Amino acid sequence: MWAFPERFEGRHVRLEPLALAHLPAFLRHYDPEVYRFLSRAPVAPTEEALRAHLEGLLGEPGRVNWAILFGKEVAGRISVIAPEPEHAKLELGTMLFKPFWGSPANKEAKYLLLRHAFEVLRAERVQFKVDLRNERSQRALEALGAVREGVLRKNRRLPDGAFRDDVVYSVLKEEWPGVKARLEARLY
Amino acid sequence: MWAFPERFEGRHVRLEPLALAHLPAFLRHYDPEVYRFLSRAPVAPTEEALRAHLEGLLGEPGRVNWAILFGKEVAGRISVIAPEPEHAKLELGTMLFKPFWGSPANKEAKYLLLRHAFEVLRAERVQFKVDLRNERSQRALEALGAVREGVLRKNRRLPDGAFRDDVVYSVLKEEWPGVKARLEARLY
């Protein structure tokens, strides 16, 4: 099993261990539109539900959550999914509030981990899964350098009961020099 | 709940719990061209290597194996991988000895589990992961009814360090009626 840093630093945002202390943020920054294109959505528009949300995220083995901090506020959060050492691969899922879409808070969130994955963890693959209904993340990831392999029809189930069409993305190791390159010039 | 019978009677082949006693068959038709583009492949043409191979299949987390009996003799084997009743989906891995390629055995072998999944298990998804290099199996799933969703670049690492490009195929619950008619045609 690999080791993931607790806190990160950049020029726009800084990551840190996602704890229940950031609960108040998710409370005020609540919107049924932000939690409708994710594999895991809250139970109800209440503190009790949102509280159990973070508890579950920090519950599933292998996943390490982080709180995206765009300065003094909380843009959102990001974590790693299905960390597979033997296969030298992993997954990354970003989630930023509506009032934070378009800001580099999402660009660095990935950049920070992508750098720790390939350069440090010596990863060979980093896939991303976004709902086919959410063109937002799609436009972003595709404008990030990731390759849109395809879409897994009804790959997973939605918190509401329906089925989700996960669009699989990915960034090979030899593709890092490019992605990182464009980002350093896209952010810095 | 989800369950997999031990017997599957067919007009061509019959499936049964893949036991270790079915070893004399694999060692009888061991061909490098078979276990070439497969995640599961012995280390050498010996009864000792195959022994650690069979046990590996029957000892995989929630994986059921079956022996494709074609004409009072083993023609190959089929199994269900990643049985995830949660999202109502599952994978199907198949393989047959070279001296058997061209027989309805392979087609019917899947047909039995395909219907038992959609009709019985009321499944919603059934994906098939084949090697990008293994073009033979690819064209085989084309006539079956599987849809080409995409190819996972270096999804998994082979026991030799070589990365494999697993191609993703699948059949929706609404596509069964069509696929079933595609099999019963050549099979019957």
How many other C-beta atoms are found inside a 10 Å radius of the C-beta of residue B68?
Answer: 32
Tell whether A147 lies on the interface with B, counting CB pairs under 8 A.
Answer: yes
For β-strands A125-131 and A89-96, DSSP reports them as parallel
Closest CA to B18 of B72, B59, B71, B61: B59
Query: Residue A126 gets which letter from DSSP?
Result: E
**Residues A101-133 as b or e (16 or more Cβ within 10 Å = b):** eebbbbbbbbbbbbbbbbeebebbbbbbbbbee
Distance from CA of A76 to the nearest CA of B (A): 27
Topology of the domain comprising B1-188: Aminopeptidase (3.40.630)
B109 and B13 Cβ atoms separated by less than 8 Å: yes
Residue with tokens 């997973």: A156
B126 and B92 Cβ atoms separated by less than 8 Å: yes
**Residue B149 parent element (H or E):** strand B147-157
Tell whether B156 lies on the interface with A, counting CB pairs under 8 A.
Answer: yes
Radius of gyration of chain B (CA): 16
For β-strands B74-84 and B89-96, DSSP reports them as antiparallel
How many other C-beta atoms are found inside a 10 Å radius of the C-beta of residue A89?
Answer: 23
Hey, of B39, B89, B118, which one would you mutate to test binding to chain A, going by the most A CBs within 10 A of its CB?
Answer: B89
**Residue A148 parent element (H or E):** strand A147-157
Count of CB pairs separated by less than 8 Å, A with B: 55
Q: What technique was this entry resolved by?
A: X-ray
Distance from CA of A18 to the nearest CA of B (A): 27
- Name the residue type at position B76: G
Chain A neighbors of B168, CB-CB under 8 A: 150, 152
Closest CB to A149: pick one of B147, B151, B170. Answer: B151
Closest CA to B12 of B94, B69, B65: B69
The C-alpha atoms of residue B188 and residue B184 are separated, in whole angstroms, by 5
| Residue ranges covered by each domain of chain B | 1-188
Residues with Cβ within 8 Å of B174's Cβ and at least 6 positions away in sequence, in order, are none
Chain B neighbors of A89, CB-CB under 8 A: 154-155
CA dihedral B174, B177, B183, B185 (to 10 degrees): -150
Closest CA to A163 of B175, B125, B148: B125
The C-alpha atoms of residue B8 and residue A86 are separated, in whole angstroms, by 36
